[PDB]
Point group: D2
Chain length 112, copies 4
């Protein structure tokens, strides 16, 4: 089974720690990048080995917000890997600059 709980690191150099996840599939943690809290959920439905999930990172050094979503996989080499895609929403003043507030990208995590 692929568990979210733990310490992860990615291709960009950022690290992430996730706490235990309750029965409601909920969980919290911290996102570290060269610290901000994050709160997410894991899909419990058919209680699968490779869960789908999503979390929000409330940036504490700016008024932007990032949301990641992806799946917890057991790689071919037998290792746990998190494939995720995110949307980074920056804040704009007029509802007219809104068309450019959203960036999109990816991030692959592996256990620390």
């Amino acid at each position: 089974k692929c568990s979210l709980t733990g310490k992860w690191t990615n291709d960009l150099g950022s690290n992430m720690t996730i706490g235990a996840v309750n029965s409601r599939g909920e969980f919290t943690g911290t996102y570290t990048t060269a610290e901000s809290p994050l709160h997410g959920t894991e899909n419990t439905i058919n209680k699968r080995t490779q869960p789908t999930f999503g979390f929000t990172v409330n940036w504490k050094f700016s008024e932007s917000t990032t949301v990641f979503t992806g799946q917890c996989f057991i790689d071919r080499n037998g290792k746990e890997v998190l494939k995720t895609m995110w949307l980074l929403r920056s804040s704009v003043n007029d509802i007219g600059d809104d068309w450019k507030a959203t960036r999109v990208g990816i991030n692959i995590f592996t256990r620390l």
Copy 2:
């Protein structure tokens, strides 16, 4: 512009969001024809901004999928929520991962 309350959108889905603590957290329900799913998000409180940026995850109850929403609460007069989302599907093997993510838009208005 506060997230608390009742919203609906262009597709025709309703969303209910409760109070948000001093840390910006909040919970709510997501309704779409119908099935209700829990929602857990957070709003950026960095600058006590009147048009706060925010994000939340909808944990689907009728599927093994997940959907994340990010956006900003704009005072159009009326309060409008402009969002963009990512819909992650669950695939059996890491080989198909590439085709598992849909992206799209959604404008919410006070129900």
Copy 3:
């Protein structure tokens, strides 16, 4: 049948003109926003009434690039409408700032 050929306008105020599309599904045109050329393709496969397509806009006022993709629909009210999503790639100097060069958005077009 929903044709790409013609003059369109969108929700953002930008206008667009598309030329005839050959048998290879190819076509060119111009994108006007408050002028840059664009070159695209339309999917011919099962020669459908509501084609799928994609085009690139070679910005002539900056070194960024935008690509749109979507489908040509016959709306319920009987009108032609183009639902599209785009990616706007801005250019960065170091392959390390790459994680933030891509923005994503939407654009709905209707005939002028």
Copy 4:
């Protein structure tokens, strides 16, 4: 960093791009296991940049779908192409449009 040549990627697809005129246009073939599809793109020539931004459309031959790619040619030493794409599926009714677009990444390297 020029697009002309032969590239392959992480998924394992090959792409061949021909010469690009003075306007930045170019054509090529897209191979994926196998089926070959034509590609038509353009590269930004605004600043005679050595690491040009670019975009192109792949007109699928075995489906009614379309895929657009945008990105930048980076000199990693080696020439690398970092791209992001949108895969549009064709739906019968404008009602399902919302679920018709997939997004993803792709890193190309000189084959």
